[PDB]
Write a protein that binds this ligand. Structure first.
Ligand SMILES: Cc1ncc(COP(=O)(O)O)c(CNc2co[nH]c2=O)c1O
Ligand SMILES: Cc1ncc(COP(=O)(O)O)c(CNc2co[nH]c2=O)c1O
Lengths: 362, 362
């Protein structure tokens, strides 16, 4: 049987080099890195190199932290809740600015925060499917503790003006967090250029395992623990380290940046092929802008078919995809593992499935 | 070279059957279980069986939850912080009772909670190295939201009277949490017998991977998310599921209970051998009670040697162990993988190392 994975914005496959690098730490290198003996110290080089890859991948500096967490969602809840106690309860800066495009990890936590009495303003989405930096400018008040905008939308795949917002925030003295999970491995990421205080990522979106991610914390910025017990990760996030995954995610990030050119030049080419070969069906449009997008994502609506339906049908022919808010539209999410063969086949099976669904309509 | 691992209360080695069961989900079964297509649905049976093993392992009932978390420390911070908003801020029950023996995941979070204005009373440890259930009884007030006592001490390895406290709490209407990480795989665990509302475990203490654990939540007991974003785990803990680890931890727990008899009957026998063959050195005593202990742990002090020292020396001869509060004492932590050969050797190298350190003293 031959299947086609186009659900990469949902999760990706672990690169074999990632699997390989991790295996030893699930076999004999199973010491706890906190221990003082050989079983624990023996794991330090591996860990250190993995971390090196992470720092290097996002151009964090030695004086910054990249804290290992259990996933981006941990990262997000941590920034929001920590800024809550630090900035909102303790310094009275009881406002947060974010967007409506933000992953439920951000919005939902915000929802809880307003439940506690924070006022959060969710920036509305424009015609262009984007946000503009001036848009937060006329929302930052003396009460704003934090602005949080995602680096790229998980649904449409379009990049936001992170540098702009970075500059705004630098200027007006408000903490900046970017949820960058959709950015890693897809477009260059630079916390320095972004003037970010906080950045989130999750490994399984760039060919590492599910169940680990990271939060970048900028030098001398404080953030009260979400995991108290303060021994590991410079006391900012306690719990025995996930050695195998840490080593894997480090390799994963290395490979991701190493394939940044490929991502734009062929995965992007393939994405454009799927897209413009695909819009040759009647009555179909891509949801939002096609310029300021991540190379691997296309979100298409077909006029007179609910997104899900097309998904179920496509599944039957061994091709995986997801939905996305526009009724609902369908999201196709490529990766470095897809072939031209595969998307030719996709154009075929998609058009076929579309026209069949449309005419049994009557 | 041949090494001897006796640091099992710090972390354990993954059972090979655990490694084996997990491998497929790091290779081709890499779908995201939330997805609707074949890549996601294909993982449901595996997950469901893994969860079945967890429920079965702790005698949770179908109407209870066992929520996958990223480790026990997550579990602990979650119970404490959630009970904080639910019971303390919202119902005015601004007291918690716990012990001083509790892992830093519990105590440290408590420390933060008193920073916010909760009053926490840490029960003191007796002569017997234990706690008595009547001890919490004369500390539970109209303000008590929660009592938290660990099922077994990570340092001495001694069991606490969980049933007693369970009954007390049932009676007096206060939420009960037990951090059971040291109990799993070591002594029978029964949330029902324990009348627990909440129970924590971490897989890497019973031969699963580091970086996953669980929180048992009793039917109709509420607990506000620590991970908001409310999609996975019946909206109680959001973030893409850690498939490989979930499957592994399930196998891990199955094997742990399956070896409960062995644990008491041979690992315990080996532990007793190390212990009574070991106390034949002058000036040495085991820290606390030797009756109400987990089968695999011995914590010994040597009179006139700081624990660490003995640790460094023992490391040089390829034998791993840890310290523990009494100066400091040394903790030897066995598992189902240790052999009689190994502990004979240990008695040898320990006595040798002890007498050498003692006489270069002069
Ligand atoms: C009772 C107990 N609770 C919580 C933890 C924290 O576990 P985690 O969240 O999986 O990191 C440990 C680990 N105990 C020890 C870990 O290292 N040395 C120990 O004695 C523990 O023994
Ligand atoms: C931007 C962004 N933030 C956070 C998350 C949460 O990641 P986690 O903590 O690793 O589970 C996702 C995952 N995005 C999607 C996950 O599933 N479908 C998606 O579109 C994401 O795309």
């Amino acid at each position: 049987v031959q299947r086609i994975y186009l659900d990469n914005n949902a999760t990706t496959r672990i690169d074999p080099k990632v699997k390989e690098i991790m295996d030893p730490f699930l076999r004999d290198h199973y010491g706890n890195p906190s221990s003082l003996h050989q079983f624990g110290t023996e794991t330090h080089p591996a860990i250190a190199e993995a971390l090196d890859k992470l720092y290097k991948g996002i151009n964090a500096r030695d004086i910054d932290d990249v804290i290992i967490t259990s996933c981006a969602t941990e990262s997000n809840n941590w920034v929001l809740k920590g800024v809550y106690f630090d900035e909102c309860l303790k310094k009275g800066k009881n406002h947060i600015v974010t967007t409506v495009a933000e992953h439920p990890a951000v919005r939902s936590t915000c929802n809880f925060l307003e439940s506690l009495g924070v006022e959060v303003t969710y920036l509305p989405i424009n015609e262009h499917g984007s946000i503009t930096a001036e848009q937060v400018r006329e929302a930052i008040t003396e009460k704003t503790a934090l602005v949080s905008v995602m680096w790229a939308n998980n649904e449409t795949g379009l990049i936001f003006p992170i540098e702009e917002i970075g500059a705004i925030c630098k200027e007006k003295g408000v903490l900046f967090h970017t949820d960058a999970v959709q950015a890693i491995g897809k477009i260059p990421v630079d916390v320095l250029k972004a003037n970010a205080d906080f950045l989130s990522f999750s490994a399984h979106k760039f060919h590492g395992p599910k169940g680990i991610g990271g939060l970048y914390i900028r030098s001398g910025v404080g953030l009260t623990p979400l995991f108290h017990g303060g021994e590991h990760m410079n006391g900012r996030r306690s719990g025995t380290l996930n050695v195998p995954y840490i080593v894997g995610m480090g390799e994963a990030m290395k490979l991701a940046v190493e394939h940044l050119d490929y991502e734009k030049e062929v995965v992007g080419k393939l994405r454009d092929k799927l897209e413009e070969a695909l819009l040759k069906i009647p009555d179909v449009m891509v949801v939002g802008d096609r310029i300021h997008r991540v190379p691997n994502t296309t979100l298409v609506s077909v006029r007179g078919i609910e997104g899900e339906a097309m998904l179920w049908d496509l599944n039957r022919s061994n091709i995986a995809a997801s939905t996305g808010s526009a009724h609902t539209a369908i999201r196709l999410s490529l990766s470095r593992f897809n072939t031209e063969a595969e998307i030719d086949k996709t154009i075929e099976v998609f058009s076929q499935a579309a026209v069949r669904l449309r005419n049994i309509s009557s």
